[PDB]
Design a protein around this ligand. Structure first.
Ligand code: FE
Length: 280
């Protein structure tokens, strides 16, 4: 029973962790592939794994950790301590808030869509793996170094990826307003149906607001995330006449064995599909 026991809240963080740790650790990821990680009801296995974990990684910044959110209840019930047992892998990023907001609690969580934040998350993960499992420091550091270099290369690709697309075609449209960090990092504005995942997601007024916007700046493609109900964007597509070009990966990686089945793979998929769809 000597491997470090690690719990990650979702498949993106779990995949980054795997990239650093390989088979050195026993890793459990809570939110199933393709499920919303903002609001999830942990299963009996999840609570057991969390209680028995040596280290727990979560996104923070208002993904799963609001005062009434699922992860907060989870670690509370598991009697765990912040920055001893559980660590927000977003610590250190430049935080972007939900529109019009600036206060703690109203962060936009979707930082990993800027690859430079994926690097910060990875560095944070490696920092705690080394702190808690020093015997494997060599492996963690070696894997971190290779992984950061690979993410850096994709980041450079992302910075050029949309250069051939006319400014009046550059709008990424997704269901959730989850692209703020990508839009900032890579110079492609984004629009959405609802601003962050919550309990209602897809009022007629939200759909109408998006449809109206799509008349002013009219992209050649819409996109749909792998982790949301598609029906609202299908309505948007029907009403605008703009096709859904591809599924993309925002709040989850793809299922294992399918394209996009890692953080690196899902971001490469997004860059390819989004640039290809918008260039039509
Ligand atoms: Fe989200």
């Amino acid at each position: 029973s000597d491997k470090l026991k690690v719990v990650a809240t979702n498949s993106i963080i779990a995949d980054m962790t795997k990239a650093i740790a390989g088979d050195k650790i026993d890793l459990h990821s809570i939110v199933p592939i393709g499920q919303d990680p903002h609001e999830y009801e942990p299963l009996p296995e999840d609570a057991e794994k969390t209680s028995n974990a040596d280290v727990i990684f979560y996104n923070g910044i208002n993904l799963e950790d609001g005062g009434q959110a699922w992860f907060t209840k989870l670690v509370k019930n598991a009697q765990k301590t912040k920055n001893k047992d559980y660590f927000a892998v977003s610590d250190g990023i430049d935080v972007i808030y939900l529109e019009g907001a600036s206060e703690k609690g109203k962060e936009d969580p979707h930082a990993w869509l800027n690859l430079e934040n994926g690097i910060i998350y990875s560095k944070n993960i490696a920092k705690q793996l080394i702190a808690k499992d020093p015997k494997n420091k060599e492996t963690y550091e070696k894997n971190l170094k290779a992984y950061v270099a690979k993410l850096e290369k994709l980041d450079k690709e992302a910075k050029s990826k949309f250069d051939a697309i006319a400014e009046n075609k550059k709008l990424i449209v997704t269901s959730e307003g989850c692209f703020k960090y990508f839009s900032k990092a890579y110079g492609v504005p984004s629009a959405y149906i609802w601003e962050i995942n919550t309990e209602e997601e897809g009022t007629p007024d939200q759909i109408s607001s998006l449809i109206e916007k799509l008349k002013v700046i009219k992209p050649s493609a819409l996109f749909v995330e792998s982790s949301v109900d598609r029906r609202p964007m299908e309505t948007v597509s029907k009403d605008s006449g703009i096709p859904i070009y591809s599924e993309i990966f925002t709040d989850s990686i793809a299922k294992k064995g399918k394209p996009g089945d890692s953080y690196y793979a899902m971001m490469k998929w997004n860059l390819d599909k989004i640039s290809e769809g918008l260039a039509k």
